[PDB]
Design an enzyme around this catalytic site. Structure first.
Site, mmCIF file in Angstrom:
data_model
loop_
_atom_site.group_PDB
_atom_site.id
_atom_site.type_symbol
_atom_site.label_atom_id
_atom_site.label_comp_id
_atom_site.label_asym_id
_atom_site.label_seq_id
_atom_site.Cartn_x
_atom_site.Cartn_y
_atom_site.Cartn_z
ATOM 1 N N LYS B 64 0.791 -1.031 -0.206
ATOM 2 C CA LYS B 64 -0.017 0.094 -0.123
ATOM 3 C C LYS B 64 0.850 1.353 -0.136
ATOM 4 O O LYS B 64 1.770 1.550 1.049
ATOM 5 C CB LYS B 64 -0.979 -0.057 1.258
ATOM 6 C CG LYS B 64 -2.045 1.268 1.308
ATOM 7 C CD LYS B 64 -2.974 0.920 2.110
ATOM 8 C CE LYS B 64 -2.206 1.636 3.518
ATOM 9 N NZ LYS B 64 -3.213 1.266 4.689
ATOM 10 N N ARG B 108 -10.680 -1.215 6.402
ATOM 11 C CA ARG B 108 -10.056 -2.218 7.213
ATOM 12 C C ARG B 108 -9.602 -1.660 8.593
ATOM 13 O O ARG B 108 -9.539 -2.473 9.519
ATOM 14 C CB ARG B 108 -8.574 -2.729 6.330
ATOM 15 C CG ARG B 108 -7.648 -1.655 6.263
ATOM 16 C CD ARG B 108 -6.502 -1.819 7.376
ATOM 17 N NE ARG B 108 -5.033 -1.222 7.105
ATOM 18 C CZ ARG B 108 -4.512 -0.437 7.676
ATOM 19 N NH1 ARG B 108 -4.915 0.057 8.847
ATOM 20 N NH2 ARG B 108 -3.057 0.055 7.285
ATOM 21 N N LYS B 228 0.102 9.764 27.584
ATOM 22 C CA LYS B 228 1.080 8.426 28.191
ATOM 23 C C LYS B 228 0.457 7.815 29.428
ATOM 24 O O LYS B 228 0.766 6.512 29.308
ATOM 25 C CB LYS B 228 2.230 9.033 28.387
ATOM 26 C CG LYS B 228 3.303 9.462 27.221
ATOM 27 C CD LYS B 228 4.461 9.897 27.748
ATOM 28 C CE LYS B 228 5.233 10.687 26.442
ATOM 29 N NZ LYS B 228 6.550 11.276 27.055
HETATM 30 N N1 LIG Z 1 -3.929 3.159 13.110
HETATM 31 C C1 LIG Z 1 -4.089 2.939 11.670
HETATM 32 O O1 LIG Z 1 -4.187 1.753 11.068
HETATM 33 C C2 LIG Z 1 -4.673 3.958 10.741
HETATM 34 C C3 LIG Z 1 -5.032 3.736 9.287
HETATM 35 C C4 LIG Z 1 -5.477 4.790 8.671
HETATM 36 C C5 LIG Z 1 -5.747 6.235 9.160
HETATM 37 N N2 LIG Z 1 -5.382 6.192 10.227
HETATM 38 C C6 LIG Z 1 -5.323 7.520 10.913
HETATM 39 O O2 LIG Z 1 -6.728 8.191 10.880
HETATM 40 C C7 LIG Z 1 -6.415 9.686 11.269
HETATM 41 C C8 LIG Z 1 -7.568 10.413 10.502
HETATM 42 O O3 LIG Z 1 -7.769 10.114 9.095
HETATM 43 P P1 LIG Z 1 -8.756 10.997 8.422
HETATM 44 O O4 LIG Z 1 -10.249 10.935 9.108
HETATM 45 O O5 LIG Z 1 -9.040 10.373 6.974
HETATM 46 O O6 LIG Z 1 -8.260 12.416 8.108
HETATM 47 P P2 LIG Z 1 -9.274 13.511 8.022
HETATM 48 O O7 LIG Z 1 -10.056 13.420 6.868
HETATM 49 O O8 LIG Z 1 -8.435 14.978 7.761
HETATM 50 O O9 LIG Z 1 -10.193 13.881 9.502
HETATM 51 C C9 LIG Z 1 -9.330 14.468 10.405
HETATM 52 C C10 LIG Z 1 -10.549 15.110 11.227
HETATM 53 O O10 LIG Z 1 -10.137 15.106 12.542
HETATM 54 C C11 LIG Z 1 -10.531 16.252 13.300
HETATM 55 N N3 LIG Z 1 -10.121 16.466 14.735
HETATM 56 C C12 LIG Z 1 -10.809 16.386 15.770
HETATM 57 N N4 LIG Z 1 -9.893 16.654 16.768
HETATM 58 C C13 LIG Z 1 -8.759 17.098 16.329
HETATM 59 C C14 LIG Z 1 -7.527 17.527 17.250
HETATM 60 N N5 LIG Z 1 -7.552 17.511 18.394
HETATM 61 N N6 LIG Z 1 -6.472 17.915 16.219
HETATM 62 C C15 LIG Z 1 -6.658 17.783 14.855
HETATM 63 N N7 LIG Z 1 -7.699 17.354 14.176
HETATM 64 C C16 LIG Z 1 -8.847 17.084 14.955
HETATM 65 C C17 LIG Z 1 -10.480 17.140 12.368
HETATM 66 O O11 LIG Z 1 -11.411 18.188 12.383
HETATM 67 C C18 LIG Z 1 -10.456 16.759 11.176
HETATM 68 O O12 LIG Z 1 -11.793 16.895 10.568
HETATM 69 C C19 LIG Z 1 -5.178 10.040 10.660
HETATM 70 O O13 LIG Z 1 -4.204 10.589 11.542
HETATM 71 C C20 LIG Z 1 -4.535 8.733 10.170
HETATM 72 O O14 LIG Z 1 -3.276 8.675 10.803
HETATM 73 C C21 LIG Z 1 -4.931 5.443 11.204
HETATM 74 O O1 LIG Z 2 -4.406 7.463 5.833
HETATM 75 C C1 LIG Z 2 -2.905 7.284 6.229
HETATM 76 O O2 LIG Z 2 -2.544 8.735 6.824
HETATM 77 C C2 LIG Z 2 -2.114 6.162 6.289
HETATM 78 C C3 LIG Z 2 -2.186 5.229 7.534
HETATM 79 C C4 LIG Z 2 -1.875 3.738 7.193
HETATM 80 O O3 LIG Z 2 -1.851 3.532 6.141
HETATM 81 C C5 LIG Z 2 -1.188 3.098 8.474
HETATM 82 O O4 LIG Z 2 -0.113 3.512 8.920
HETATM 83 O O5 LIG Z 2 -1.929 2.242 8.730
#
Ligand SMILES: NC(=O)c1ccc[n+]([C@@H]2O[C@H](COP(=O)([O-])OP(=O)([O-])OC[C@H]3O[C@@H](n4cnc5c(N)[nH+]cnc54)[C@H](O)[C@@H]3O)[C@@H](O)[C@H]2O)c1
Ligand SMILES: O=C(O)CCC(=O)C(=O)O
Ligand SMILES: NC(=O)c1ccc[n+]([C@@H]2O[C@H](COP(=O)([O-])OP(=O)([O-])OC[C@H]3O[C@@H](n4cnc5c(N)[nH+]cnc54)[C@H](O)[C@@H]3O)[C@@H](O)[C@H]2O)c1
Ligand SMILES: O=C(O)CCC(=O)C(=O)O
Lengths: 318, 318
Positions: B64, B108, B228
């Site tokens: 990916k 996922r 933390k």
């Molecule tokens: N752990 C995983 O496997 C995994 C996989 C894919 C994405 N992610 C995470 O998912 C997160 C969000 O993705 P997304 O929704 O598509 O992005 P996005 O579409 O930009 O949504 C983010 C939203 O969060 C809101 N938000 C609420 N509180 C806060 C805050 N305190 N600080 C900043 N923003 C805030 C913000 O307003 C925004 O609308 C990312 O940080 C990725 O890293 C994690």
């Molecule tokens: O949407 C992203 O920022 C990538 C997140 C991702 O692919 C992961 O680290 O699991």
């Protein structure tokens, strides 16, 4: 929203079947490399020779996802190497192109030897040696002939006798003015080469130091072909990226090699920070690991050329 | 020779717009993970939040290549996340599919919370909390509602007040039988959640330990949201891959955390090697970094479903 898909045929049509675009791209890429204006993470190898390797980098951003396995021409009548290159708009990080990788990969690698030979090969070299008649070897030879006008003899060796014979035959037809020689073993081919390029798929070294002529330049593209002794006996050793290289690591791990003993990185020769060949007796070794910036820069140049000629298939992302 | 291209619309048509296929795929993926029948190299981050990350793995093989930058919904009216997924035939390592990544990635990740909640959430939980109303948050909510029948209230908070309001409104229209609550701050939303999912794009933690109800389960998808103290005060801490996790590294680097203190890896809960929630008072934290095998397995399942229904664009490689 949109991405341009460029298969090998589209890449060829866009001009990716000639060395000059790759030479220009890598000259730009290596210059940026010497000034550290790149982000090139360590490549992860995905292993179940038999491998798939992710090569991401920023200069444009992108990645080469190139798979390989040795069984291919042998068992399934397919090319060993295959894969895709994704190009990304750094302003957006959105993918803007999906491109076939193997042709670009081989041509840029051929461009590596070209640029290096420009700085490291002896003046007025006439004898070229190609070890390995795969896709790499074919492009190495093609690019050298396009970039160097007076190549007079081409010594060719391949473990596969038929692959070598077929290679020599069709190239002799493409350039009847050039004498192509099918050697019986690697030693004859290497011994008679003023410029030697390795394009094989082996794990064990076979090229000995005393095989190399005085003044010879060896572009160790396939890497594993060269005995450890050549690294320590060559007058000048050149790599593409030292941090990448760490066969050299174990030499450093043992009391036999170090960065201080290294002559230069390829990008430094291009920028003119460090001189290349300084006399006609020097035996010079190039040990390139291959860098992702070389593929991304090449693909990006081709991508632009394709767009200008409206070549390719427009894909929608959503 | 041929590859199947699957854009987001094709993925949706193939069934990638519902959680069940992702649940099945990850159940298979995590089971293989617990038995170490995978090859998952450390992801390299390409940085010029603002990043592109290569996620290659073998289970099928693939990668990916997902780009991100925070400026997107804010400045250019584009989704933050975007990219492609390449699927490879392990027998050949040749690419067999080029697929859009963002939808699959979000679904996922939503499946991660689902499977974890199946083992870690309290029995008969009714109150769900979603922090962050992006693509991730929307899919998290969608999947939880599809997989858990008696979710009665949904607490929603987002820094963007309009994005939260719009989120709550349309979801209230999609499920008028469910009470969606737009909170004024993160504390109210977290305080009232028996299951809490973080879906934001922040660098600084804000969620305090005492915000969490007794018996609560927090799926820390966006990772950075959690202080933390929660890692050290939670009764059970669960990750996807411990080697991947090393926010936890510094806790280990300091005298505050270790693998011995870790309860389990998510794959171990699936296989039943380690029990999940063992009483109704336990506060349980899931800290998933995201694994490439989760995307590849999901994409592969979708790829097969698309082929069975003849969905997608056939591309030639040469
Ligand atoms: N752990 C995983 O496997 C995994 C996989 C894919 C994405 N992610 C995470 O998912 C997160 C969000 O993705 P997304 O929704 O598509 O992005 P996005 O579409 O930009 O949504 C983010 C939203 O969060 C809101 N938000 C609420 N509180 C806060 C805050 N305190 N600080 C900043 N923003 C805030 C913000 O307003 C925004 O609308 C990312 O940080 C990725 O890293 C994690
Ligand atoms: O949407 C992203 O920022 C990538 C997140 C991702 O692919 C992961 O680290 O699991
Ligand atoms: N340094 C780089 O940047 C870079 C880039 C791309 C490829 N490569 C290398 O190029 C090499 C060859 O690629 P390819 O030509 O497309 O594969 P290929 O098409 O399978 O060609 C390999 C050929 O080498 C022949 N060969 C000759 N001598 C030997 C020997 N002693 N042991 C084994 N085989 C031998 C063999 O017969 C075969 O025909 C690979 O090993 C790649 O790793 C290097
Ligand atoms: O064709 C291959 O085996 C991949 C070679 C390559 O991309 C490199 O490491 O430079």
């Amino acid at each position: 929203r949109e991405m341009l898909y460029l298969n090998r045929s589209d890449i060829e049509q866009a001009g990716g079947n000639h060395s000059q675009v790759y030479v220009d791209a890598l000259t730009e890429a290596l210059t940026a490399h010497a000034h550290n204006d790149f982000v090139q993470p360590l490549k992860p190898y995905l292993r179940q020779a038999d491998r798939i390797i992710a090569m991401p980098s920023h200069i444009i951003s992108g990645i080469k996802w190139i798979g390989s396995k040795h069984d291919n021409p042998s068992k399934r009548n397919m090319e060993r190497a295959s894969g895709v290159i994704i190009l990304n708009d750094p302003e957006t990080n959105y993918p803007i192109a999906v491109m076939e990788a193997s042709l670009i990969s081989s041509m840029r690698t051929a461009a590596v030897s070209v640029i290096a030979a420009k700085h490291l090969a002896k003046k007025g070299f006439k004898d070229l040696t190609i070890i390995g008649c795969g896709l790499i070897g074919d492009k190495q030879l093609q690019s050298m002939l396009e970039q160097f006008d007076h190549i007079e003899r081409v010594f060719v060796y391949d473990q596969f006798s038929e692959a070598c014979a077929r290679f020599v035959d069709r190239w002799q037809q493409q350039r009847p003015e050039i004498n192509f020689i099918a050697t019986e073993n690697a030693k004859e081919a290497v011994s008679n080469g003023e410029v030697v390029i390795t394009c094989t798929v082996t794990d064990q070294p076979y090229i000995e130091y005393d095989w190399l002529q005085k003044g010879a330049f060896i572009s160790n593209i396939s890497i594993m072909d060269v005995h450890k002794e050549v690294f320590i006996k060559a007058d000048k050793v050149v790599v593409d990226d030292w941090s990448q290289c760490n066969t050299i690591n174990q030499l450093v791990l043992e009391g036999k090699f170090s960065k201080e003993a290294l002559h230069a990185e390829l990008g430094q020769l291009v920028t003119g920070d460090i001189p290349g060949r300084e006399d006609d007796d020097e035996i010079i070794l190039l040990n390139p690991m291959g860098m992702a910036i070389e593929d991304i820069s090449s693909a990006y140049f081709i991508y632009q050329q394709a767009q200008q000629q409206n070549i390719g298939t427009t894909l929608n992302l959503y």
